[PDB]
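Handout, section 4.2: multi-component inputs.
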Amino acid sequence: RQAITRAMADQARTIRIPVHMVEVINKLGRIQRELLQDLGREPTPEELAKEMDITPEKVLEIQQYAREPISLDQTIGDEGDSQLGDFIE
DNA sequence: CGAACCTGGTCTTGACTCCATTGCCGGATTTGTATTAGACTGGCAGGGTTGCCCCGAAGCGGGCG
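Output:
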């Protein structure tokens, strides 16, 4: 389980993210899931920073780092002839 | 016509001074590797549609008897 989790931390993302940032991102996701099931709504980021013993700007930095990239090979418009990369100035 | 002066770039020197360039050192943070001893031991997209090409039974006609 150690080697499988380490390989999932290494190779499962497009841009590479180190192990401790992956750990705190998964911690943030688990705590947000628990607070969503408990409170019933989406938690405030200051409440998340209160829960995770860190600062809300660090919470915002982690939420910025967690954003996976989107692909350029889908169809934006109704017709499939228009790919996504043909509307980027 | 001769002397004194004003002001033109022209150029040196002495002093100031100011800010980049390393450089060291101490600490903070950031990333990478090793380690956790009860037992645990073979999964899941997925099919459906359309069209065309390649091999097998089968008449079957010609060689065979």
